[PDB]
Amino acid sequence: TRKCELQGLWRNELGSNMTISALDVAGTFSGSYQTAVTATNKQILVSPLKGAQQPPKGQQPTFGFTVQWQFADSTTVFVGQCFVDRRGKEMLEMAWLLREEVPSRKDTWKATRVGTNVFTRVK
Amino acid sequence: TRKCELQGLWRNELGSNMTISALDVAGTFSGSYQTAVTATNKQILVSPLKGAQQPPKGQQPTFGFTVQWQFADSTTVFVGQCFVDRRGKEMLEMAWLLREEVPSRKDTWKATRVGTNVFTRVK
Amino acid sequence: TRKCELQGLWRNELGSNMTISALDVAGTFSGSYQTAVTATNKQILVSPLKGAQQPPKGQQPTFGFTVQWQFADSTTVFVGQCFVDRRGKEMLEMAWLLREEVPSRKDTWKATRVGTNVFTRVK
Amino acid sequence: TRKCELQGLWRNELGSNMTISALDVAGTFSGSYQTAVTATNKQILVSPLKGAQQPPKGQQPTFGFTVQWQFADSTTVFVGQCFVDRRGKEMLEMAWLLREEVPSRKDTWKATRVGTNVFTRVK
Ligand SMILES: O=C(O)CCCC[C@@H]1SC[C@@H]2NC(=O)N[C@@H]21
Ligand SMILES: O=C(O)CCCC[C@@H]1SC[C@@H]2NC(=O)N[C@@H]21
Ligand SMILES: O=C(O)CCCC[C@@H]1SC[C@@H]2NC(=O)N[C@@H]21
Ligand SMILES: O=C(O)CCCC[C@@H]1SC[C@@H]2NC(=O)N[C@@H]21
């Protein structure tokens, strides 16, 4: 069963697109992310990601990745697990932190936004 | 100036140790993490990490990484920026999400812990 | 228009129920919360909440509240904004932190879970 | 022992000041917050807060509150526990979410910043 294999094109509720290329045997993967949204006034560009998954009880292993935004000084990390429901539908449940670059140490308090995303496989 | 180079051994306020190996030119890095603490009842083991930094205005670039815990079903992601103060002292300001593996989709609501860490370079 | 008035019975995607009683003129409100889920092994009980909303540009004001769980040592805080869509449907977008009570200061790192909820008005 | 009574003037690492007035018997409290920092370009003003603490094993009970900022469209909620160390020193360990008001539902993804604070009692 290839169900819940991270490898693939995924989309989230914001309309973002994400590709995860094949995992190596260490469980590390790379890919790219096309966000539909930005907190900057910059043109959105496809951006590389780098992550790792835990080794596979009936449960998909947890994974995480870092997106290196190509058009913004920021960095997002996403952490999640895949689930398959009744009718075979796969979903990535993810929580994320978006870190903006700040000029001095004293601005770090405001540098991190948090939220969640739900991804499903693009048909 | 090698000030705020991620490469190195770092420690945080919890007494965790972290090594970041040299960055490649794409800005991706790997390394390992020795946490002083765990939310499981398992023996702590050194664990690989995989991350990426943004390219370097006077400001260090943001970075993120994923720790693949070797003794736990979980995954942590850390996101941060380095700062150098007056007397040349470097600090990584980081926020993180720890994701526990859960049996079903309905338990995802409780799967993510959040917090911050401050790292300084081991002498 | 009473659209997006916090006053009311709301439900979230987890199937939790929440009542917010009338706001006073200072914008503070109280109410109760019936969670469908718990991270403890205790019987769920209806729990008081205490919050405040900002004063009302076309935008609903932000609000927050604290739930004092009656069956758990923990405390949740929720922060959010209400939205009304095209066909008049109201939704509370909320982010939350659940704080478990810990025995010593050194366990605080693991004490806080984070997530989001979406509430709609019970018909 | 009045050790770890929330009632009092507290300060955090950012240099913010906070007053918590006496708790009522239900455990609800009010007070005010003077932040040293803001993410807006507005003049900072003292702001009311409204919270509740859990009832008091050797462990302080968890609490939470909402700050209704008087100079910003936002709302912060803080959740925490008090600790007393060896030499009698009290500390509030807190995690928080700052929610900015957004024009439409589609901007909610970026509306929530997260972080932590440590408060000690003003001498
Ligand atoms: O605005 C930035 O600085 C970079 C774009 C970040 C987009 C964020 S990452 C989390 C959330 N989920 C998405 O699919 N996009 C937004
Ligand atoms: O408990 C687990 O499931 C894995 C160990 C996680 C340790 C966390 S990661 C964030 C925080 N910072 C640390 O240095 N260690 C803890
Ligand atoms: O488990 C506990 O310690 C108390 C119950 C907490 C339920 C949480 S609060 C956030 C999330 N949203 C809900 O409607 N319920 C869970
Ligand atoms: O900027 C705003 O919109 C309101 C001021 C918020 C200040 C935040 S709240 C969390 C953090 N801790 C503080 O003591 N101040 C900042």
Author numbering:
A (entry chain A), B (entry chain A), C (entry chain A), D (entry chain A): 1 to 56, 59 to 125
From the paper:
Here, we expand the repertoire of known macromolecular biotin binders by reporting a novel biotin-binding protein A (BBP-A) from chicken. In the present study, we show that the chicken BBP-A gene encodes a functional homotetrameric protein. The BBP-A structures consist of four identical subunits, each subunit adopting a β-barrel fold of eight anti-parallel β-strands with an α-helix positioned between the β7- and β8-strands. The BTN/BSO-binding site is located at the open end of each β-barrel.
